[PDB]
Design a protein around this ligand. Structure first.
Ligand SMILES: Cc1cn([C@H]2C[C@H](OP(=O)(O)O)[C@@H](COP(=O)(O)O)O2)c(=O)[nH]c1=O
Ligand SMILES: [Ca+2]
Length: 129
């Protein structure tokens, strides 16, 4: 896989971020994770975590996996990076997202994210508290 440029347009919630990619607006849904909805417990905390991470970044990048690049809603499916740190992993490591939606052929970073979730669980963080 490889990282590609994008710019932030708007953080939407814990696991959706609108970005400009190849010069076009696109809503990205973060691969391999599930944050709570805003109306659910830890939903506002997940939204805030993602928002701060992408708004503070000097450099946003997206990385597509090997398989489908958009979902049935037209959302881009990618790993998002903020100054080189993966947002998807950081959410899971903080107990603000579960590893989820692991479809075959778009699962390159699965084991990395599962390791983060185990550590969040051991620490009883947030969702795991
Ligand atoms: C993360 C992800 C979600 N989706 C779909 C599955 C779910 O369909 P349904 O909408 O029918 O439940 C939905 C979950 O996204 P949200 O967690 O954003 O709701 O998005 C994909 O198809 N591929 C993916 O990689
Ligand atoms: Ca969600």
């Amino acid at each position: 896989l490889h990282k590609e440029p994008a710019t932030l347009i708007k953080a939407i919630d814990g696991d959706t971020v609108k970005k400009m990619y190849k010069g076009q607006p696109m809503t990205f849904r973060l691969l391999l994770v599930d944050t709570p909805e805003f109306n659910e417990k830890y939903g506002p905390e997940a939204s805030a975590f993602t928002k701060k991470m992408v708004e503070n970044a000097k450099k946003i990048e997206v990385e597509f996996d090997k398989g489908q690049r958009t979902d049935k809603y037209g959302r881009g499916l990618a790993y998002a990076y903020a100054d080189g740190k993966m947002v998807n992993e950081a959410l899971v490591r903080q107990g603000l997202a579960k590893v989820a939606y692991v479809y075959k052929g778009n699962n390159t970073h699965e084991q990395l994210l599962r390791k983060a979730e185990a550590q969040a669980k051991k620490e009883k963080l947030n969702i795991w508290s």
